[PDB]
Amino acid sequence: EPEVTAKVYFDVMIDSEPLGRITIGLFGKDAPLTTENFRQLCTGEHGFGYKDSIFHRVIQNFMIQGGDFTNFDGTGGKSIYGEKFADENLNVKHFVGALSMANAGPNTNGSQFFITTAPTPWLDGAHVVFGKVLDGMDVVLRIEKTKTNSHDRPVKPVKIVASGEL
Secondary structure: OOOOOEEEEEEEEOOOOEEEEEEEEEOOOOOHHHHHHHHHHHHOOOOOOOOOOEOOEEEOOOEEEEOOOOOOOOOOOOOOOOOOEOOOOOOOOOOOOEEEEOOOOOOOEOOOEEEEOOOOHHHOOOOOEEEEEEEOHHHHHHHOOOOEOHHHOEOOOOEEEEEEEO
16 A cells, blocks of 8 residues: 555544444555645645544445535535545546545545445546555444445534544
């Protein structure tokens, strides 16, 4: 995997019950702009970020998605650079535990991301891979095992009650 230059975390809990911590390593040399946007959204040093956001989409054995702190439905979110920012590096490919940038076409990176729980090569070349779950992958497996309704939305809220940099 690429060089890890920074670490951040998510303290997750599926409603009145704590699931645990997910530690993530960022690829600062391969995607500087993308990692810093994520890093700052984690620390919330701007008054907005991932704290209290949810994982609105969960697809058993594919990936889990989150980062929509504006609409909580998978339609919102925003970067520290503005509404959307360009694809910085599309050469890094996906692997289990990859933190990838969710988008709606070329250059539509906002604040939404996903964590793969299986190899997803069909995404290579279309999504910026900028991180790796270094610890807490068992927390991630628990999240993908929760009951989901239509659109694969968790019945109970999987909430990031805390986040920050290590």
